[PDB]
Amino acid sequence: GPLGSPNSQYLKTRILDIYTPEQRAGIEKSEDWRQFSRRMDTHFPKLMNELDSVYGNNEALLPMLEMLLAQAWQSYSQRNSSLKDIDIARENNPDWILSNKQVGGVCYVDLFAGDLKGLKDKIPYFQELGLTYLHLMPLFKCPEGKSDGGYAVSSYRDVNPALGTIGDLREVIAALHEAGISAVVDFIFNHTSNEHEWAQRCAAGDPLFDNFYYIFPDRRMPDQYDRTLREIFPDQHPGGFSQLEDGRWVWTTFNSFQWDLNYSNPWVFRAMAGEMLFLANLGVDILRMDAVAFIWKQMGTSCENLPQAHALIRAFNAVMRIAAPAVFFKSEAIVHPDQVVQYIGQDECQIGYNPLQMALLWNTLATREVNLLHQALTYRHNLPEHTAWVNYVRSHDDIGWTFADEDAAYLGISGYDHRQFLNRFFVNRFDGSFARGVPFQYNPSTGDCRVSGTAAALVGLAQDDPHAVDRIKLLYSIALSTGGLPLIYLGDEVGTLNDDDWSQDSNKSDDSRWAHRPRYNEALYAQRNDPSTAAGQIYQDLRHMIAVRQSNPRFDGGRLVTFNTNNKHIIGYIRNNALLAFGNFSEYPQTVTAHTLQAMPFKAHDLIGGKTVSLNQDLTLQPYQVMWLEIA
Ligand SMILES: O=C(CO)[C@@H](O[C@H]1O[C@H](CO)[C@@H](O)[C@H](O)[C@H]1O)[C@H](O)[C@H](O)CO
Ligand SMILES: OC[C@H]1O[C@](O)(CO)[C@@H](O[C@H]2O[C@H](CO)[C@@H](O)[C@H](O)[C@H]2O)[C@@H]1O
């Protein structure tokens, strides 16, 4: 703007006004201030541009921003020197996320290890597995009873006391860092629980919390909005709103006890940015940006993926570039693939879940046909510089069939009919199916349904299907080798089956996702080194692929080129022009012809099986065989 308007230099002089002139002189000369000052200059114009694009000439914008930047300085000043070293290192190495060295795991602290002290005791296991990244499921205070598995947050600062204290969390994070492991946690920034102090105060009409949520007097606007809102948990409530005891209606995209925060209020942004800086200074390395798609609402639209949602995330990003450069964002957007990828950017979310690949791994097991998977790896895999996918096989959530109908239509596939088939297959309602999953949120108004169940349940391990172990290794091979940071759902690496206690526990019984949230299975973990057990076969074969990925630089980076196998059952792709991966999605042997392989060297070492493979004749793969062939 013109002479007189706000800019980094203006804002910095006002930050320093809290100091006596004597104190100020010292602050300005300090190392912390020089670093803060240079990052302000570099990144503040982005923060201002993004916020201006959202809030425009809102009276509260300048006061809120000065408040937030004063907080950003106090936060960076307090930030521990070991974390400032990580800041400098990541500032100098934006592609750390793209290294083949990275392998992630995720677990619930309570289910996997009891409590935070118990989790700290599991760290030698994480090292034995090879993890360099560990996502811990929501850790903070939440409603007793039903809390959407911790996702209805009653406090961003107080640890759930069943898990331990903030001090225990601090020690865990430092212990993870000592072991070479990044700490990853959720930033549940779209909504709080209805017991959160802000929600109570907002609903009670406390002016300090005016417009922190979206509360309406009656159904007039909810009915209007509901004309275009998708139902995420239709078993819980219709549309996007829930009714308070006093008769008013509040926006609740998810459960009725999760109230969507009102980002059209710039004081909400500032509030959440303060919570973000608190997590940063715990030493968190990556924040999982929960429900990114939903943070802006607009009548007559889906209220998903709106331009302002992307702008607010880029504003949050610039706050981290200024006050905690180590802290990266992981986008969790389970939406149309055209929209998934728009969250991924060095200035937005540097990494994002890849639900397209994950959904299509499962699809290809069901159909035995790699067509959709091949299409996605050909046209939707490669990303902008300085960004990466998080490739995964399962998560704490159901599987949604989030492939693009337009893509499927190019292949002669009707998306609607195909999902009906996938849904039947994976819940064991299709002749011959190996899968033992359970439905989640069947919606009779749309035909939509998703699938619950662990990786091992969905491949046939519960019934001892002789192909189950090999199916698990095949799916993980692809997440481990396509390019991106792979994420193991801990428990999968020993073949953990569903919890069949869940259906009868009245705090869980309306949420079939609890089927694939079992506790740590001591008996299976105890078999992990025994090659005659399914646990041992799964664990040693995953561990072997992790060792290869992490040691072999032909896996480095996020880029791939697909290779046409000329066999509809076999997927093929090349990393770094040097590693040729084939995966057979058929339960029968399948061949890649000598003719298809003419451009390849006569012989190549297979890193999976350890044998030299001849490529100048027909290559027959065993049912569900993976080969990782060194061609350069
Ligand atoms: O269910 C979800 C939507 O299909 C939400 O998922 C996220 O938040 C939910 C509420 O906090 C929580 O239920 C779920 O475990 C969490 O992963 C995700 O934000 C969504 O997948 C991304 O677009
Ligand atoms: O076109 C005949 C037959 O010959 C090749 O082009 C090899 O010379 C086969 O194509 C395969 O190999 C290519 C180079 O490695 C690769 O890019 C193709 O994806 C793959 O099918 C083709 O089948």
XYZ file of C-alpha atoms and ligand atoms in Angstrom:
678
model
C 0.000 0.000 0.000
C 0.855 3.751 -0.123
C 3.164 5.776 2.176
C 1.644 5.271 5.686
C 0.259 1.694 5.339
C 1.432 -1.512 7.196
C 4.511 -3.438 6.204
C 7.064 -5.650 7.971
C 9.212 -2.696 9.058
C 6.306 -0.725 10.502
C 5.058 -3.809 12.322
C 8.461 -4.702 13.731
C 9.000 -1.177 15.230
C 5.650 -1.546 17.012
C 6.531 -5.050 18.269
C 9.653 -3.572 19.901
C 7.624 -0.864 21.701
C 6.876 -3.133 24.625
C 10.550 -2.764 25.658
C 12.211 -0.003 27.691
C 14.680 1.909 25.455
C 17.520 0.163 27.322
C 15.969 -3.333 26.706
C 15.123 -2.496 23.068
C 18.710 -1.775 22.138
C 19.660 -5.271 23.356
C 16.738 -7.013 21.636
C 17.665 -5.399 18.296
C 21.243 -6.532 18.521
C 20.230 -10.158 19.448
C 20.504 -13.261 17.247
C 16.823 -14.203 17.833
C 15.704 -10.795 16.674
C 17.895 -10.755 13.566
C 16.430 -14.105 12.519
C 12.870 -13.038 13.292
C 13.399 -9.734 11.484
C 14.736 -11.300 8.282
C 11.904 -13.921 8.204
C 9.364 -11.104 8.727
C 10.778 -9.315 5.737
C 10.787 -12.464 3.604
C 7.422 -13.937 4.535
C 5.273 -11.165 5.960
C 4.170 -9.926 2.497
C 2.588 -13.384 1.893
C 0.861 -13.385 5.296
C -0.582 -9.849 4.597
C -1.632 -10.721 1.027
C -3.395 -13.943 2.090
C -5.215 -12.235 4.988
C -6.211 -9.274 2.877
C -7.646 -11.687 0.275
C -9.894 -13.206 2.997
C -10.804 -10.347 5.330
C -10.456 -7.331 2.943
C -10.912 -3.979 4.775
C -12.263 -5.584 7.990
C -11.686 -3.155 10.885
C -10.245 -6.015 13.006
C -7.600 -7.086 10.505
C -4.766 -4.662 11.400
C -5.309 -4.888 15.255
C -5.511 -8.714 14.999
C -2.346 -8.914 12.925
C -0.346 -6.720 15.308
C -1.565 -8.872 18.190
C -0.587 -12.028 16.361
C 2.860 -10.774 15.312
C 3.617 -9.677 18.917
C 2.697 -13.212 19.929
C 4.824 -14.676 17.086
C 7.871 -12.760 18.409
C 7.301 -13.855 22.030
C 6.883 -17.384 20.766
C 10.006 -17.364 18.651
C 11.992 -15.718 21.544
C 10.918 -18.549 23.949
C 11.479 -21.210 21.293
C 14.149 -23.689 22.568
C 17.625 -23.472 20.844
C 17.525 -27.126 19.673
C 14.255 -26.341 17.800
C 15.865 -23.172 16.305
C 18.613 -25.464 14.908
C 15.932 -27.611 13.250
C 14.389 -24.362 11.912
C 17.654 -23.352 10.213
C 18.161 -26.845 8.858
C 14.694 -27.075 7.277
C 14.844 -23.559 5.994
C 18.058 -24.733 4.129
C 16.572 -28.089 3.108
C 12.946 -27.753 1.967
C 13.124 -31.267 0.355
C 13.792 -33.159 3.578
C 10.204 -34.514 3.173
C 11.147 -36.039 -0.204
C 14.067 -38.166 1.002
C 13.847 -41.942 0.593
C 15.230 -42.027 4.165
C 11.793 -41.047 5.578
C 9.375 -43.750 6.697
C 6.414 -42.881 8.905
C 4.189 -44.699 11.370
C 0.935 -43.648 13.140
C -0.657 -45.057 16.326
C -3.020 -44.134 19.165
C -1.004 -43.660 22.336
C -3.646 -45.402 24.482
C -4.310 -48.361 22.153
C -0.741 -48.988 21.117
C 1.153 -48.227 24.352
C -1.227 -47.387 27.190
C -0.019 -43.852 27.945
C 2.757 -41.417 26.996
C 5.356 -43.076 29.300
C 4.464 -46.438 27.726
C 4.863 -44.834 24.262
C 8.305 -43.572 25.229
C 9.148 -47.228 26.045
C 8.116 -48.265 22.518
C 10.680 -45.964 20.868
C 13.292 -48.752 20.580
C 10.656 -50.752 18.597
C 10.119 -47.705 16.312
C 13.847 -47.646 15.700
C 13.939 -51.393 15.062
C 11.219 -50.896 12.445
C 13.092 -47.979 10.848
C 10.614 -45.181 11.458
C 11.831 -41.599 11.102
C 8.364 -40.032 11.579
C 5.652 -40.845 14.139
C 2.114 -39.509 14.124
C 0.422 -39.704 17.515
C -3.427 -39.602 17.432
C -5.245 -36.726 19.229
C -3.664 -36.355 22.665
C -5.519 -33.442 24.278
C -8.545 -33.158 26.587
C -11.829 -34.192 24.983
C -15.341 -35.163 26.146
C -15.604 -38.368 28.230
C -17.516 -41.062 26.420
C -17.902 -39.948 22.844
C -15.184 -37.709 21.480
C -14.838 -38.916 17.887
C -11.694 -40.752 19.012
C -10.118 -37.505 20.412
C -11.134 -35.327 17.425
C -13.669 -33.356 19.517
C -11.165 -31.188 21.356
C -12.017 -29.537 24.692
C -8.532 -28.001 25.021
C -5.542 -27.577 22.678
C -3.106 -27.362 25.694
C -4.175 -29.810 28.388
C -3.268 -33.439 27.687
C -5.886 -36.107 28.105
C -5.055 -37.241 31.696
C -5.525 -40.909 30.780
C -2.443 -40.381 28.600
C -0.334 -38.313 30.983
C 0.667 -34.692 31.245
C 2.086 -31.936 29.075
C 5.419 -32.756 30.695
C 5.159 -36.409 29.584
C 4.425 -35.183 26.012
C 7.493 -32.916 26.102
C 9.711 -35.850 27.138
C 8.223 -38.121 24.483
C 8.914 -35.497 21.784
C 12.512 -34.991 22.972
C 12.992 -38.814 23.148
C 11.638 -39.124 19.607
C 14.047 -36.457 18.392
C 16.997 -38.178 20.181
C 16.043 -41.348 18.307
C 15.980 -39.665 14.925
C 12.177 -39.506 14.696
C 10.034 -36.430 13.805
C 6.898 -35.906 16.003
C 3.675 -35.429 14.111
C 0.355 -34.412 15.675
C -3.086 -33.233 14.664
C -4.041 -29.614 14.351
C -7.826 -29.911 14.692
C -8.474 -26.471 13.449
C -11.879 -26.676 11.762
C -13.947 -27.390 14.927
C -13.791 -27.824 18.693
C -15.886 -29.960 20.982
C -19.048 -28.419 22.371
C -17.430 -28.498 25.821
C -14.547 -26.337 24.771
C -14.458 -23.108 26.798
C -14.765 -20.987 23.573
C -17.900 -22.858 22.515
C -19.520 -22.550 25.986
C -18.659 -18.843 26.142
C -19.749 -18.194 22.552
C -23.140 -19.930 23.096
C -23.689 -18.139 26.446
C -23.315 -14.812 24.585
C -20.004 -13.762 26.116
C -18.968 -10.840 23.877
C -15.294 -11.873 23.933
C -16.385 -14.949 21.942
C -18.968 -13.359 19.655
C -19.050 -15.110 16.226
C -16.500 -17.803 17.173
C -18.888 -20.405 15.624
C -21.891 -20.294 13.231
C -25.057 -20.181 15.320
C -28.520 -19.489 13.841
C -31.890 -18.699 15.370
C -33.912 -21.352 13.518
C -33.788 -23.577 10.408
C -34.107 -20.725 7.835
C -30.365 -20.511 6.951
C -29.516 -24.141 7.823
C -32.161 -25.295 5.356
C -30.693 -23.033 2.720
C -27.145 -24.187 3.334
C -28.163 -27.869 3.432
C -29.258 -27.608 -0.254
C -25.575 -27.974 -1.185
C -23.842 -29.628 1.820
C -22.431 -33.137 1.663
C -23.174 -35.317 4.729
C -20.055 -36.667 6.354
C -21.714 -38.637 9.188
C -25.304 -39.015 7.962
C -25.995 -41.663 10.698
C -25.461 -38.835 13.257
C -27.566 -36.043 11.737
C -28.934 -34.746 8.413
C -27.110 -31.955 6.635
C -24.580 -29.668 8.324
C -26.349 -28.423 11.536
C -27.318 -29.637 14.999
C -29.884 -28.152 17.408
C -28.911 -26.742 20.793
C -31.076 -27.332 23.948
C -32.244 -23.708 23.633
C -33.557 -24.342 20.074
C -30.819 -22.467 18.118
C -28.881 -24.340 15.408
C -25.097 -24.571 15.132
C -22.849 -25.613 12.201
C -21.600 -29.152 12.826
C -20.044 -30.726 9.688
C -19.056 -33.754 11.787
C -20.669 -35.054 15.029
C -23.199 -32.864 16.816
C -20.679 -32.351 19.598
C -18.073 -30.863 17.142
C -18.815 -27.229 16.362
C -17.172 -25.640 13.281
C -15.018 -22.573 14.113
C -15.871 -19.338 12.371
C -12.872 -18.263 10.265
C -14.815 -15.310 8.875
C -13.937 -13.784 12.229
C -10.312 -12.740 12.081
C -10.060 -13.218 15.906
C -10.647 -16.944 15.270
C -7.627 -17.008 12.987
C -5.535 -15.279 15.655
C -6.821 -17.725 18.317
C -5.870 -20.764 16.256
C -2.568 -19.251 15.237
C -1.746 -18.933 18.961
C -2.609 -22.607 19.449
C -0.427 -23.464 16.415
C 2.607 -21.598 18.000
C 2.079 -23.490 21.319
C 2.278 -26.846 19.454
C 5.280 -25.577 17.483
C 7.187 -24.809 20.663
C 6.516 -28.315 21.997
C 8.873 -29.342 19.179
C 6.174 -30.790 16.859
C 7.709 -31.295 13.379
C 4.551 -31.755 11.326
C 0.965 -30.661 11.951
C -1.783 -32.753 10.388
C -4.209 -30.096 9.234
C -7.486 -31.843 10.026
C -10.502 -31.102 7.776
C -8.709 -28.403 5.710
C -11.500 -28.470 3.071
C -14.170 -27.159 5.493
C -12.699 -23.980 6.936
C -14.645 -21.549 4.727
C -18.421 -21.454 4.251
C -20.465 -19.725 1.586
C -24.234 -20.020 0.920
C -25.036 -21.841 -2.341
C -21.664 -23.640 -2.522
C -20.512 -26.954 -1.053
C -18.580 -25.081 1.661
C -15.599 -27.340 0.711
C -12.359 -26.313 -0.939
C -13.304 -22.619 -1.259
C -10.591 -20.096 -2.290
C -10.548 -18.558 1.217
C -9.843 -21.932 2.794
C -6.648 -22.197 0.731
C -5.766 -18.592 1.553
C -6.120 -19.145 5.341
C -3.854 -22.178 5.206
C -1.208 -20.161 3.301
C -1.571 -17.489 6.001
C -0.959 -20.159 8.669
C 2.010 -21.345 6.621
C 3.603 -17.871 6.535
C 3.171 -17.680 10.382
C 5.347 -20.806 10.691
C 7.938 -19.413 8.180
C 8.169 -16.388 10.469
C 8.069 -17.972 13.954
C 8.775 -21.744 13.691
C 10.285 -22.616 10.246
C 10.756 -26.338 11.217
C 7.040 -26.855 11.405
C 5.544 -28.320 8.205
C 1.862 -29.027 7.377
C 0.248 -32.288 6.235
C -3.023 -31.733 4.389
C -5.791 -34.202 5.165
C -8.217 -33.540 2.244
C -10.232 -36.644 1.298
C -12.040 -35.060 -1.614
C -12.078 -35.109 -5.444
C -8.508 -35.613 -6.768
C -8.599 -32.245 -8.600
C -9.214 -30.632 -5.237
C -6.866 -32.841 -3.127
C -3.841 -31.553 -4.963
C -4.646 -27.851 -4.639
C -3.713 -27.962 -0.907
C -0.231 -29.187 -1.743
C 2.301 -26.385 -2.198
C 5.492 -25.188 -0.523
C 3.559 -22.095 0.658
C 0.427 -24.102 1.697
C 0.670 -27.763 2.844
C 4.118 -29.087 1.925
C 2.833 -32.657 2.200
C -0.604 -34.174 1.843
C -2.286 -37.558 2.182
C -2.711 -39.357 -1.164
C -6.213 -40.917 -0.843
C -6.327 -41.509 -4.579
C -3.445 -43.947 -4.557
C -4.634 -45.556 -1.326
C -8.279 -46.046 -2.573
C -7.012 -47.412 -5.923
C -4.627 -49.949 -4.214
C -7.810 -51.477 -2.685
C -9.794 -51.117 -5.843
C -7.088 -53.020 -7.799
C -7.091 -55.902 -5.246
C -10.841 -56.251 -5.810
C -10.978 -55.964 -9.605
C -7.476 -57.487 -10.318
C -7.183 -54.723 -12.971
C -4.539 -51.988 -12.643
C -6.263 -49.568 -15.149
C -7.411 -46.921 -12.610
C -4.221 -47.266 -10.537
C -2.071 -46.885 -13.712
C -4.087 -43.835 -14.812
C -3.584 -42.157 -11.385
C 0.178 -42.973 -11.268
C 0.581 -41.627 -14.872
C -1.418 -38.378 -14.566
C -1.823 -37.477 -10.915
C 1.326 -38.579 -9.114
C 3.956 -35.940 -9.883
C 3.794 -32.813 -7.673
C 5.262 -29.268 -7.560
C 8.839 -28.830 -6.367
C 9.352 -28.948 -2.576
C 6.225 -30.983 -1.855
C 5.437 -34.666 -1.345
C 2.553 -37.163 -0.975
C 2.011 -39.125 2.166
C 1.354 -42.556 0.679
C -0.585 -44.962 2.907
C -2.471 -48.277 2.885
C -4.827 -47.725 5.882
C -5.561 -45.075 8.467
C -7.690 -44.661 11.570
C -10.564 -43.768 9.214
C -12.764 -45.754 6.868
C -11.740 -46.052 3.236
C -13.706 -43.747 0.883
C -13.758 -44.484 -2.861
C -12.381 -41.061 -3.860
C -11.345 -41.600 -7.475
C -12.524 -39.114 -10.141
C -15.691 -40.136 -11.994
C -14.418 -38.146 -15.030
C -11.238 -40.218 -14.999
C -13.156 -43.467 -14.658
C -15.456 -42.354 -17.514
C -12.412 -42.090 -19.849
C -11.873 -45.792 -19.059
C -15.475 -46.894 -19.686
C -16.131 -47.160 -15.947
C -19.329 -45.763 -14.276
C -18.196 -44.364 -10.922
C -21.534 -44.840 -9.204
C -21.878 -48.525 -10.254
C -18.220 -49.218 -9.542
C -18.458 -47.922 -5.971
C -21.529 -50.130 -5.372
C -19.375 -53.044 -6.444
C -16.401 -51.966 -4.268
C -18.691 -51.500 -1.295
C -20.253 -54.968 -1.750
C -16.813 -56.599 -2.196
C -15.110 -55.143 0.818
C -17.892 -55.949 3.283
C -18.044 -59.636 2.098
C -21.310 -59.251 0.101
C -19.903 -60.340 -3.224
C -19.390 -63.933 -4.276
C -15.824 -65.065 -3.634
C -14.644 -61.914 -1.839
C -11.612 -62.343 0.413
C -12.451 -59.138 2.301
C -13.928 -58.983 5.819
C -14.682 -55.244 6.243
C -17.774 -53.616 7.806
C -19.875 -50.752 6.281
C -19.482 -47.164 7.451
C -22.066 -44.398 6.840
C -24.167 -46.019 4.195
C -26.273 -43.040 3.011
C -29.681 -44.147 1.550
C -30.248 -40.724 -0.005
C -27.017 -40.914 -2.158
C -25.997 -44.624 -2.349
C -22.634 -43.577 -0.787
C -20.882 -45.911 1.636
C -17.362 -46.314 3.021
C -15.511 -49.310 4.454
C -14.110 -50.034 7.928
C -11.631 -52.867 8.734
C -7.858 -53.313 9.173
C -5.534 -54.005 6.252
C -5.302 -57.680 7.374
C -9.110 -58.025 7.639
C -9.616 -56.600 4.118
C -7.088 -58.926 2.439
C -8.431 -62.223 3.988
C -6.065 -62.792 6.915
C -8.942 -63.297 9.399
C -9.895 -66.536 7.512
C -6.219 -67.482 6.825
C -6.524 -66.822 3.060
C -3.200 -68.139 1.718
C -2.759 -64.915 -0.365
C -3.413 -62.500 2.562
C 0.217 -62.032 3.650
C 1.366 -61.361 0.041
C -1.467 -58.894 -0.580
C -0.331 -56.832 2.449
C 3.302 -56.795 1.236
C 2.150 -55.792 -2.302
C 0.002 -52.821 -1.134
C 2.769 -51.545 1.190
C 5.403 -52.001 -1.524
C 3.637 -49.487 -3.671
C 3.239 -46.881 -0.841
C 6.953 -47.521 0.011
C 8.252 -47.101 -3.528
C 6.123 -44.723 -5.643
C 7.794 -41.553 -4.270
C 6.514 -39.670 -1.231
C 6.649 -40.299 2.479
C 5.021 -43.678 3.264
C 2.951 -44.010 6.386
C 2.456 -47.395 8.129
C -0.686 -47.845 10.231
C 1.081 -49.396 13.185
C -0.277 -52.888 13.853
C -0.432 -53.649 10.075
C 3.162 -54.779 10.167
C 2.183 -57.897 12.188
C -1.187 -58.557 10.564
C -3.423 -57.075 13.226
C -7.105 -58.065 12.770
C -10.278 -56.102 13.568
C -11.436 -55.374 17.091
C -14.744 -57.346 17.424
C -15.352 -55.755 20.877
C -16.283 -52.457 19.204
C -19.896 -53.257 18.122
C -21.090 -53.768 21.656
C -19.318 -50.911 23.466
C -22.087 -48.288 23.612
C -19.593 -45.335 23.242
C -18.394 -46.961 19.897
C -21.222 -49.012 18.544
C -22.595 -46.364 16.187
C -19.023 -45.846 14.673
C -17.674 -48.864 12.812
C -14.299 -47.192 12.388
C -13.546 -48.664 15.834
C -13.378 -52.079 14.024
C -9.966 -51.084 12.626
C -8.648 -49.477 15.812
C -7.446 -52.558 17.724
C -5.106 -52.511 20.667
C -1.474 -53.547 20.417
C -1.601 -57.361 19.973
C 1.096 -58.776 22.232
C 0.811 -62.298 20.714
C 1.442 -61.029 17.135
C 4.253 -58.678 18.143
C 5.855 -61.647 19.870
C 5.809 -63.597 16.533
C 7.454 -60.841 14.427
C 10.797 -62.608 14.149
C 9.251 -66.057 13.458
C 9.223 -66.632 9.619
C 6.656 -69.422 9.943
C 3.939 -67.138 11.245
C 1.831 -64.606 9.297
C 3.041 -61.906 11.763
C 6.652 -62.756 11.080
C 6.159 -62.975 7.340
C 4.441 -59.600 7.206
C 6.921 -57.927 9.551
C 10.091 -59.280 7.936
C 8.850 -58.512 4.494
C 7.802 -54.926 5.303
C 11.001 -54.412 7.285
C 13.035 -55.632 4.313
C 11.309 -53.143 1.930
C 11.835 -50.343 4.454
C 15.583 -51.256 4.658
C 15.867 -51.236 0.834
C 13.929 -47.973 0.402
C 15.943 -46.183 3.084
C 19.377 -47.417 1.946
C 18.961 -47.244 -1.869
C 19.048 -43.782 -3.443
C 17.135 -44.971 -6.559
C 14.012 -44.473 -4.332
C 14.771 -40.802 -3.583
C 12.359 -37.999 -4.431
C 8.652 -37.964 -5.371
C 8.676 -38.426 -9.151
C 7.813 -41.538 -11.215
C 7.232 -42.554 -14.796
C 4.792 -45.428 -15.426
C 5.782 -48.374 -17.592
C 3.060 -50.032 -19.737
C 3.256 -53.717 -18.795
C 0.776 -54.863 -21.512
C -0.801 -57.067 -18.840
C -3.986 -55.676 -17.327
C -3.149 -57.296 -13.946
C 0.398 -55.922 -13.514
C 1.349 -52.410 -12.470
C 4.735 -51.013 -13.584
C 6.632 -47.788 -12.900
C 10.182 -46.451 -12.864
C 11.939 -44.340 -10.208
C 14.920 -42.176 -11.147
C 15.300 -44.024 -14.456
C 16.998 -46.734 -12.372
C 14.454 -48.837 -10.446
C 11.669 -50.703 -12.286
C 8.860 -51.922 -9.982
C 6.277 -54.503 -11.090
C 3.339 -55.649 -8.893
C 1.007 -58.463 -9.849
C -2.560 -57.775 -8.619
C -3.790 -61.196 -9.811
C -4.123 -64.289 -7.605
C -2.730 -66.228 -10.621
C 0.710 -66.029 -12.270
C 0.922 -63.211 -14.796
C 3.487 -62.476 -17.469
C 5.289 -59.448 -18.773
C 6.526 -60.467 -22.249
C 10.065 -60.427 -23.558
C 8.653 -58.114 -26.238
C 7.402 -55.539 -23.632
C 10.854 -55.679 -21.968
C 13.045 -55.118 -25.070
C 14.441 -51.773 -23.899
C 15.578 -53.138 -20.530
C 18.998 -54.653 -19.713
C 19.202 -58.439 -20.218
C 19.512 -59.039 -16.499
C 18.536 -57.070 -13.431
C 18.813 -57.644 -9.726
C 15.419 -57.905 -7.911
C 15.824 -56.139 -4.534
C 12.671 -57.870 -3.193
C 13.606 -61.540 -3.674
C 17.411 -60.986 -4.009
C 17.703 -62.930 -7.267
C 19.003 -61.871 -10.700
C 16.055 -61.732 -13.116
C 16.329 -62.267 -16.905
C 14.556 -59.520 -18.885
C 15.353 -60.783 -22.363
C 12.658 -63.472 -22.063
C 9.112 -63.594 -20.659
C 8.952 -62.561 -16.979
C 6.345 -64.526 -14.982
C 5.298 -63.109 -11.645
C 3.761 -65.331 -8.939
C 0.371 -64.369 -7.534
C 0.775 -60.919 -5.831
C 4.532 -60.884 -6.456
C 6.413 -57.556 -6.285
C 9.770 -57.041 -8.010
C 11.990 -54.006 -7.584
C 14.482 -54.344 -10.450
C 17.705 -52.337 -10.536
C 17.948 -51.294 -14.203
C 20.610 -48.639 -13.632
O -14.322 -37.566 7.991
C -13.771 -36.663 7.346
C -14.294 -36.319 5.934
O -14.611 -37.461 5.053
C -12.616 -35.923 8.051
O -11.638 -36.727 8.831
C -11.026 -36.042 9.966
O -11.869 -35.331 10.950
C -13.011 -35.981 11.405
C -13.507 -34.865 12.434
O -12.415 -34.255 13.167
C -12.569 -37.246 12.140
O -13.724 -37.887 12.183
C -11.576 -38.130 11.339
O -11.091 -39.262 12.122
C -10.433 -37.197 10.879
O -9.503 -37.981 10.179
C -11.517 -35.362 7.192
O -11.306 -34.027 7.605
C -11.869 -35.562 5.745
O -11.748 -36.985 5.584
C -10.941 -34.784 4.814
O -11.695 -34.172 3.784
O 6.571 -50.832 -28.916
C 6.988 -52.222 -28.811
C 7.428 -52.568 -27.361
O 8.767 -52.049 -27.366
C 8.920 -51.161 -26.187
O 8.683 -49.759 -26.524
C 10.347 -51.336 -25.670
O 11.264 -50.884 -26.692
C 7.846 -51.589 -25.198
O 7.453 -50.437 -24.360
C 7.908 -50.680 -22.992
O 9.234 -50.154 -22.695
C 9.328 -48.712 -22.873
C 10.748 -48.158 -22.629
O 11.263 -48.748 -21.457
C 8.311 -48.086 -21.871
O 8.352 -46.673 -21.904
C 6.860 -48.550 -22.147
O 6.036 -47.972 -21.078
C 6.825 -50.086 -22.044
O 5.524 -50.647 -22.368
C 6.724 -51.850 -26.181
O 5.824 -52.703 -25.547
